[PDB]
Amino acid sequence: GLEAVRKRPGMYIGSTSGEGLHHLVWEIVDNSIDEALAGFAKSIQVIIEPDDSITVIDDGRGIPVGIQAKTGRPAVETVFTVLGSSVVNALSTSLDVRVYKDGKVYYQEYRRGAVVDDLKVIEETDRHGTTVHFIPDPEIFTETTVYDFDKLATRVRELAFLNRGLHISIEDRREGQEDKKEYHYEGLEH
């Protein structure tokens, strides 16, 4: 399964250069955009964390957490472990997901694609949505693991335009260069 992704990442993300590094972000963001298209997510945050890891937050319904009859596993686990989202998981040292749903925070983490523990309720919550955080694997991204804020921001702006009505932001939390841009193109209320 995902072991094939780790050994032939070029076949799944096109390049293991800086281009592939950035592609990981778009694979995750595309899931959030699908939840905006479904009509439930209204706001997406993309964050470059101080260690060049990435957090993507949406306020949609939250990935389904119920057990699937076919797999016997929670749907959210299958999202990350069965062969875009699972490709990002495979090519990350660690990926953690938090699903905010029905007053509960469901949490699972993976390491180089492998499950750490069964999905668990860790907290109560009043919000809804999905947060994915991932650390790209330098064993895969041997040229660079350093994100380009302008490159991400340029595409985030384009995505806001193409998904008119969506609020989407990009934030850099790295030392000496903290920045944030927020985008929102108005609908019929304009």
Ligand X SMILES: CNc1cc(F)cc2c1[nH]c1nc(Oc3cnc(C)nc3)nc(N3C[C@H]4CCN[C@H]4C3)c12
Binding residues for ligand X (CB under 6 A): 28, 31-32, 34-35, 56, 58, 60-64, 79, 85, 130, 132
Q: Are 76 and 104 in contact, with CB atoms under 8 Å apart?
A: no
Tell the smallest beta-carbon distance from residue 84 to ligand X (Å): 8
**CB of 27 or CB of 172, closer to ligand X:** 27
Tell the smallest beta-carbon distance from residue 141 to ligand X (Å): 19
Tell the smallest beta-carbon distance from residue 190 to ligand X (Å): 27
**CB of 18 or CB of 84, closer to ligand X:** 84
Tell the smallest beta-carbon distance from residue 37 to ligand X (Å): 9
DSSP designation for 158:
H
Nearest 5°: the CA angle 108, 5, 113 is: 20
Tell me which amino acid residue 120 is. K
61 CB-near residues (< 8 Å, 6+ apart): 35, 38, 40, 101, 128, 129
CB count in 10 Å sphere of residue 169: 18
**CB of 75 or CB of 121, closer to ligand X:** 75
**CB of 30 or CB of 148, closer to ligand X:** 30
